[PDB]
Amino acid sequence: FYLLWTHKLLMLHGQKLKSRAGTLLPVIQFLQKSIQRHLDDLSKLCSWNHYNMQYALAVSKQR
Amino acid sequence: ASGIFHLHELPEFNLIHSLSISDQSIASVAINSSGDWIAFGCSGLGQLLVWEWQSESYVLKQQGHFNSMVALAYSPDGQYIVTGGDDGKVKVWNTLSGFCFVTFTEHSSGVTGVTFTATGYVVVTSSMDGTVRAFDLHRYRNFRTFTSPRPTQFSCVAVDASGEIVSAGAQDSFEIFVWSMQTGRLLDVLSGHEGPISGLCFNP
Amino acid sequence: SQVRDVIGFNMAGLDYLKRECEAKSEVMFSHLEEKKRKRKKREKLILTLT
Amino acid sequence: EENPEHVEIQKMMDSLFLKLDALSNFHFIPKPPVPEIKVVSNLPAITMEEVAPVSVSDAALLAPEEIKEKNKAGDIKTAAEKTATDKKRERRKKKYQ
Amino acid sequence: PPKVPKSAPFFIPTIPGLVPRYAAPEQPQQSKVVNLGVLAQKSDFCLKLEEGLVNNKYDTALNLLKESGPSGIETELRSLSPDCGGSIEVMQSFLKMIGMMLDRKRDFELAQAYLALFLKLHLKMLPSEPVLLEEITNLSSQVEENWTHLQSLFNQSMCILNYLKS
Amino acid sequence: EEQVVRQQELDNLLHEKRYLRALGLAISLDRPHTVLTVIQAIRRDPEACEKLEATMLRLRRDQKEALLRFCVTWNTNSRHCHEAQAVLGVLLRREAPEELLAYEGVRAALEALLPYTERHFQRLSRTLQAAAFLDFLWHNMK
Amino acid sequence: EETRKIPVPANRYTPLKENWMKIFTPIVEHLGLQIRFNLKSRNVEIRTCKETKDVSALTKAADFVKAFILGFQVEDALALIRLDDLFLESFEITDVKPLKGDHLSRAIGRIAGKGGKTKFTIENVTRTRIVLADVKVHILGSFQNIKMARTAICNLILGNPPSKVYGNIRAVASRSADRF
């Protein structure tokens, strides 16, 4: 839900925020790390499923 | 008092096993309701230890000397804090959890200054050893060490935003030493000050 | 995405073969001598300013 | 370690020197670091971390180049493939060394 | 390692644990020598999984799974193997547990975490048994469509923020 | 006289642009660099690309052992990793996992293949993050 | 006053004799019970008395003698009186799988191993004491520790190679006592 909110505001107002990017540094940093945090663990786990499952789906085919 | 603890089963007085915790004495000991965990405190170094006897492993083990810390820094993200102390240990803490997770003991004497690079997960320290050492958090190694041609003691550290330049100042030689990060050779010695250098800072 | 997926599929396959080779090693584990040989094999040397 | 006298003398130096620098409030002439060789082993970087129930960084603890050394060009050519210039360069380098 | 005396006896008192992995320790002055078929032989988690097959409800097993700690979770999934005493029918129940959590789209991180451990433990036994495959084909599609939608939303956010920095 | 006869055939096949057939002989002659140039030429050509995995199955066992140890060196170079990973894909998918353990030198080869693969996966991941910038330009398009 | 009697056969008659004082002393001194061994009935008798202060002693005394009759050492059996959690378990081999003759003989061989290696190996990792008498297998230990013993033994009976059997127990027993 908050991902969609952030995505919409960013995609709408990024060009306007670029001009005043100098005074918004403490905010962006904050936002960035939060959006980073969750992402990393998911990128560790979901892919560890996906490819591995595909690998299993490969072996069943060669048999 | 010697820093060892013993386990016994009282009605028969059977020694199960014994350990040595530290050179200092053990001040206080407590055991939880379940009996699996035993708590030890050593006021000599302020060391706290939780021991699970059945699993023969530590659950928690921390140590911090009193009045040791002198330095501070933040990671660019703001997620970690690196500090150095008079004892000579460099410690990285995670602010969310509140526990130290990596400690570097390469330095022999106390660390006077500490800094993160602006981009990478690299921590640079300057010590009374006469050395400025850089550590990486990806592989946990001291990959670069800078020393002066002359035996001198450094009081502070400053690193450029790009991270190519490393600089330090001395207690006695009254001159700022500047080294290159990637090559590791002494680029230059800046002179002109009279008296020790109180502090340095790069323009971001 | 396709280039990443090809590399990603090799990541999973190689990891499984890594675990099978380590599983075989446990069978042989004279145990101290075998463990010493395994540790001696995985020891590299680096330059360091002490 | 096999000479008891040198071991005994070194321990006397340690006790004395830690006393002496304290009187100077840690103001002494430092010892330059001597270069040495240290043994790192190929196992995950969790082992170097402090005791904790969760691990923040997962890594090999050892660089990919260290595990398998790579030539400068990054490619290997057998003697059959080597052309005229390639053999000339290897001759030139060997005489250069 | 801790120093252990040789004179120490073989049996030392035991603490069962903060949470009981096995439901029933014993059946006031009853006997302690018994034949087989009396002591508990199936984990409480395995018992809940078996019931989940009949009624297509795994919430009871889910609550135990989210309450036991990581050392306990690894033991439970290791016990699920046929070698350790868990039927291949029961492993079918655990795969159906994971799928249900993806349809509800709640507790998303636990779904990926537990499934990743299960894949690590019994990958070698997996392609041989055909029944588990049909669960994977459903599971493989769901994790692909869920991650891809989220991965795009994550990636567009970070690239915009970096562009604001430079 | 055997090598020069075999060498003569290889040069003819390269001259005739018959890369699929030339792949077999250069492996037997133990030419890693020549095979690497052949693999790149196959993937540039459209029709040869799909028939790559079909050809690789026709190779006998010792050619697969030599080709697998060729991939270790190629994977080290970032410029040459893509075709090295392409060959490794055919090995993992077509061939049985227990049979991969039967190969000679697979244990030593497996040590070097993993660390460089993690580097490549991370590098492609950052490119995907940068590639999302195309979507941002599209919404700001007029 | 109530009594319970436990039989003893020919192969365990003599070990009871040199170790009679070892078994006699704890019961009368600590559990406060009167003990007699009838020669004619070949059967040991336990009874309560005025000096018996606790009612649980009769159950513990019956188990303590039972373990010694089964072939357990006196000190290991003595742990039953002091430790409540210890259980002793006994099952037949033919229950898990029906085997006849030579195949039954090889099954005992797989569990025991050359020189007793397999039984001794399972003994340390599971921290259980195992007595193997032909088709009957006896395990003494804690409730959790019994399962790791029986899981290894039954898998050994069903034809699994011993090398796999050691690995699975070692993996599971390592994480058994972590306690969260």
F124: nearest CA in chain C? C4
Angle CA F60–F65–F67, to nearest 5: 95
Structure tokens at E6: 């040789």
Same domain, G87 and G165: yes
3-class DSSP state for residue F126? Answer: helix
Per DSSP, the residues of chain C read -HHHHHHHHHHHHHHHHHHHHHHHHHHH--HHHHHHHHHHHS-EEEEEE-
Residue E16, chain G, CB below 8 Å: the answer is yes
Same domain, G37 and G64: yes
Please indicate, yes or no, if residue G165 is contained in any of the structural domains: yes
Q: C48, D38: Cβ pair inside 8 Å?
A: yes
3-class DSSP state for residue G136? Answer: strand
Segment A15-22 long-range contacts (CB within 8 Å, at least 24 positions apart) = A15/F140, A17/E164, A18/E163, A18/E164, A21/E164, A21/E165
Name the phi and psi angles at B78, rounded to 5.
90, 15
Method: cryo-EM
Segment D71-76 long-range contacts (CB within 8 Å, at least 24 positions apart) = D74/F76, D74/F77, D74/F79, D74/F80, D75/F33, D75/F36, D75/F73, D75/F74, D75/F77, D75/F80, D76/F32, D76/F33, D76/F73
What's the 3-state SS for chain B?
CCCEEEEEECCCCEEEEEEECCCCCCCEEEECCCCCEEEEEECCCCEEEEEECCCCEEEEEEECCCCCECCCCECCCCCEEEEEECCCCEEEEECCCCCEEEEECCCCCCEEEEEECCCCCEEEEEECCCEEEEEECCCCEEEEEEECCCCCCEEEEEECCCCCEEEEEECCCCCEEEEECCCCCEEEEECCCCCCCCCCCCCC
Instruction: Choose among B76, B62, B86: nearest CA to B118.
Output: B76
Q: Which of G82, G107, G134 is the last residue of a domain?
A: G82
Amino acid residing at G21:
M
Cα of first residue to Cα of last residue in chain E, in angstroms, is 53
| Beta-ladder partners of B41 | B28, B48
Pairing of strands B165-170, B176-180: antiparallel
Angle CA G74–G76–G77, to nearest 5: 65
F139 vs A11, A59, A61: nearest CB:
A11
Asked if residues G149 and G140 have their Cβ atoms less than 8 Å apart, the reply is: no
Touch test B–F: 3 Cβ pairs or more under 8 Å: no
Element of type H or E holding E108: helix E108-121
Q: What share of chain G is helix, strand, coil (3-state, %, to 5)?
A: 55, 20, 30
Same domain, G93 and G170: yes
Q: A50, E160: Cβ pair inside 8 Å?
A: no
Residue B173, chain D, CB below 8 Å: the answer is no
- Phi/psi class of residue B46: alpha, beta or left (left: φ > 0; alpha: ψ in -120 to 50)? left
Same domain, G89 and G72: no
Name the phi and psi angles at G70, rounded to 5.
-65, -25
- Measured distance CA(G63)–CA(D1) in Å, rounded: 58
Please indicate, yes or no, if residue G135 is contained in any of the structural domains: yes
Smallest Cα distance from E122 to chain B, Å: 26
- Measured distance CA(E69)–CA(E71) in Å, rounded: 6
Same domain, G64 and G104: no
Touch test A–G: 3 Cβ pairs or more under 8 Å: no
Number of domains observed in the structure of chain G: 2
Q: F95, A59: Cβ pair inside 8 Å?
A: no
- Measured distance CA(G178)–CA(G180) in Å, rounded: 6
What is the four-CA torsion angle of F32, F38, F42, F48, rounded to 10 degrees? -100
Residues of D in contact with C46 (CB under 8 A): 37-38, 40, 66
Touch test E–G: 3 Cβ pairs or more under 8 Å: yes
Same domain, G119 and G74: no
CA atoms within 13 A on the CB side of B55: 21
- Measured distance CA(E158)–CA(A14) in Å, rounded: 12
For F97, residues 6+ apart whose C-beta sits below 8 A from its C-beta are A59, C16, C17, C20
Please indicate, yes or no, if residue G180 is contained in any of the structural domains: no
Please indicate, yes or no, if residue G70 is contained in any of the structural domains: yes
- Measured distance CA(G66)–CA(G58) in Å, rounded: 12
Angle CA E144–E147–E148, to nearest 5: 80
- Measured distance CA(G98)–CA(E159) in Å, rounded: 67
Same domain, G77 and G32: yes
Per DSSP, the residues of G84-119 read SS-EEEEEESTTTS---THHHHHHHHHHH-GGGHHH
Residues of G in contact with B36 (CB under 8 A): 179
Same domain, G58 and G113: no
| Residues in chain C preceding a C-to-N separation beyond 2.5 angstroms (breaks) | 29
Same domain, G157 and G95: yes
Q: E137, A57: Cβ pair inside 8 Å?
A: yes
C49: nearest CA in chain B? B145
Residues of C in contact with G163 (CB under 8 A): 27
Same domain, G72 and G99: no
Pairing of strands E33-35, G87-92: parallel
Residue E12, chain B, CB below 8 Å: the answer is yes
CA distances from G76 to B13, G24, G83 (A): 18, 15, 11
Q: Neighbouring chains of C at 3+ CB pairs within 8 Å? A: A, B, D, E, F, G
In the numeric block, the tokens 């009396």 are attached to E38
CA distances from E70 to D43, E101, E117, F63, G174 (A): 22, 19, 10, 46, 13
- Measured distance CA(G59)–CA(F121) in Å, rounded: 66
- Measured distance CA(B201)–CA(B203) in Å, rounded: 7
Same domain, G17 and G38: yes
3-class DSSP state for residue G122? Answer: helix
Please indicate, yes or no, if residue G168 is contained in any of the structural domains: yes
Name the phi and psi angles at F133, rounded to 5.
-65, -25
- Measured distance CA(C5)–CA(B107) in Å, rounded: 44
State the alpha helices, DSSP H only, in chain F: 2-15, 19-28, 32-44, 46-50, 52-58, 61-76, 81-94, 97-100, 106-131, 133-139
D74 vs F77, F115, F119: nearest CB:
F77
Asked if residues F70 and F35 have their Cβ atoms less than 8 Å apart, the reply is: yes
Q: Which of G82, G101, G127 is the last residue of a domain?
A: G82
* Structural domain harbouring G121: 83-175
Asked if residues G168 and E125 have their Cβ atoms less than 8 Å apart, the reply is: no
Structure tokens at G26: 């704890």
Same domain, G50 and G35: yes
Instruction: Choose among E94, E104, E113: nearest CA to E142.
Output: E104
Residue C6, chain D, CB below 8 Å: the answer is no
Element of type H or E holding E98: helix E88-104
For B36, residues 6+ apart whose C-beta sits below 8 A from its C-beta are B52, B53, B54, E15, E17, G179
Please indicate, yes or no, if residue G121 is contained in any of the structural domains: yes
Structure tokens at D58: 């997962």
Q: Identify residues of F whose CB sits under 8 angstroms from chain C CBs.
A: 82, 85-86, 88-89, 92-93, 97, 100-101, 106-107, 110, 113-114, 117-118, 120-121, 124-125, 127-128
Structure tokens at B112: 């006077």
Structure tokens at E55: 């009624």
Q: Neighbouring chains of E at 3+ CB pairs within 8 Å? A: A, B, C, F, G
B19: nearest CA in chain E? E2
Residue B24, chain C, CB below 8 Å: the answer is no
Residues 2-61 of A with CB under 8 A from E: 3-4, 6-7, 10-11, 14, 17-18, 21, 24, 28, 31-32, 35-36, 39, 41-43, 45-50, 52-54, 56-57, 59-60
- Measured distance CA(F134)–CA(A16) in Å, rounded: 18
For G23, residues 6+ apart whose C-beta sits below 8 A from its C-beta are G16, G64, G65, G68, G74
Structure tokens at D73: 């060009």
Q: Which of G82, G98, G128 is the last residue of a domain?
A: G82
What is the C-alpha R_g of chain B?
22
Residue F130, chain E, CB below 8 Å: the answer is yes
Residue E13, chain B, CB below 8 Å: the answer is yes
B63-74 exposure pattern, b = at least 16 Cβ within 10 A, e = fewer? bbeeebbebebe
Structure tokens at E164: 């604001």
Other CB atoms within 10 A of residue E139 CB: 20
Instruction: Choose among G102, G70, G99, G116: nearest CA to G157.
Output: G99
Asked if residues F35 and F22 have their Cβ atoms less than 8 Å apart, the reply is: no
Cα of first residue to Cα of last residue in chain C, in angstroms, is 45
